[PDB]
Amino acid sequence: MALINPQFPYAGPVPIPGPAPTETMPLLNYRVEGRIAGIQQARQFMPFLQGPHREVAEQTYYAIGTGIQMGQTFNQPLINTQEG
């Protein structure tokens, strides 16, 4: 967006020496076929386990029984003959 100087104008570009025209043109680089080499193993001996863990520990229980329940020799009360 330059302003044209009317007192000192200039013309378009003139030819100048050039950079040997084939040396600015590249070759198209020619890929050969390739292979991810080797026979891959199916599994890996991992350093960490792959499953979930638990944040807190919960107390577990198992039921037990008591035993054969016996009789008893109670201390027996007195007879309510109007004193009680």
Binding site: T66, G67, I68, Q69, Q72
Partner: protein, 49 residues
Amino acid sequence: APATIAAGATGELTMYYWVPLAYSETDLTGAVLANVPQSKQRLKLEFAN
């Protein structure tokens, strides 16, 4: 217990231990039911050599 047993003297100790099963006389936590014909219940006591 005597505080000092001299050279050629005899001392007599006495000591009482309460081995708790229930927590208190009101809170019956840790008490066991033993009203059974037989049980696998024992009290092992190691003493001073």
